[PDB]
Design an enzyme around this catalytic site. Sequence first.
Site, PDB file in Angstrom:
ATOM      1  CB  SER A  63      -0.959   0.120   1.043  1.00  0.00           C
ATOM      2  OG  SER A  63      -2.165   0.755   0.744  1.00  0.00           O
TER       3      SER A  63
HETATM    4 CL   LIG Z   1      -1.636   2.400   3.150  1.00  0.00          CL
END
Ligand SMILES: [Cl-]
Length: 246
Positions: free
Chosen positions: A93
């Site tokens: 991410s």
């Molecule tokens: Cl993140």
Amino acid sequence: HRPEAEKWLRRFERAPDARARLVCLPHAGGSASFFFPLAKALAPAVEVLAVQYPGRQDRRHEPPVDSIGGLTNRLLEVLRPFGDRPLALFGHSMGAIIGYELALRMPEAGLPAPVHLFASGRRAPSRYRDDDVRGASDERLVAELRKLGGSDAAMLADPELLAMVLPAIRSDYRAVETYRHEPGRRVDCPVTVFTGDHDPRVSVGEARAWEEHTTGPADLRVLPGGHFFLVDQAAPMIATMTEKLA
Ligand SMILES: [Cl-]
């Protein structure tokens, strides 16, 4: 300077004869300890250097670094001493973005180019999304982390630690969502992309799009799961990474 730099890295399993070091960059709300199993899994052939951002765990009292660029600037200095062997980057991410920025910046910063970038749980840097359809409530972000168990979830259980870490989660989230790539730029190393099949913020097309960000080969692996697919799908990822780093 080195003592300060060492605050940013955790080596859970020394691998003095590693052929590569793998810098592992956690998601928002994720700490170095997230990569403890991976360090054990990749040694002795690969040494994991798990990144501890300010605001995390033992660094909980330090204010979060509030931008991707700020994190990158600091991490470039952290990684200077590792030019004696190949260095690869893995990020999930937010970590995927920091990994990409590090890879782009490293040569002009005076560091050898990385040999591989593993981008997990993140759309290509050029791929824009407006605000999450789900919103980004404190409750959802904490709940996702709690589900993972382990050290980060244990921390969240203590209301006093929660109070401190919530603004760090929020700062991280805002840093990633406000991040904008520099159009036209490409890394030179291979990019291997891992994504969950039902991560609502990463479509297969957006994951494939990492190919627009390297001059070298891009690879795409879609694994079952949502945004944190990599926990339950650790084994095939480790197998793929081992193969790529061999
Ligand atoms: Cl993140």
